[PDB]
Homo-oligomer: A and B are copies of this chain.
Amino acid sequence: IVYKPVDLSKVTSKCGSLGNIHHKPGGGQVEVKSEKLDFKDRVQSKIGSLDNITHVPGGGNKKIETHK
């Protein structure tokens, strides 16, 4: 009996922002004015002219193999 399985296989994930070009991007003025506001539970707020956001919860790899 000769048992010589060969695995050269590639499992690859390229997830998120990759190889992009952003030439001279520009956010104009942002102006937020607030008066007599009332809040009675949690507040999350974000303010800003130019944003570039990447989230990657994904992109995981799994490779299960078995020989008998």
List chain A positions with a Cβ less than 8 A from chain B: 1-68
Partner pick for A58 among B15, B46, B64, CB 8 A cutoff: B15
On whether the beta carbons of A51 and B54 are closer than 8 Å, the reply is no
Binding site secondary structure of chain A:
strand
On whether the beta carbons of A65 and B68 are closer than 8 Å, the reply is no
Copies per complex of this chain: 3
Between A and B, 14 residue pairs with Cβ closer than 8 Å are A1-B3, A4-B5, A6-B8, A17-B54, A28-B30, A29-B29, A31-B33, A35-B37, A36-B36, A43-B45, A51-B52, A52-B53, A55-B56, A60-B60
Question: Contacts A59-B59, A63-B11; is A3 near B3 (CB within 8 Å)?
Answer: yes
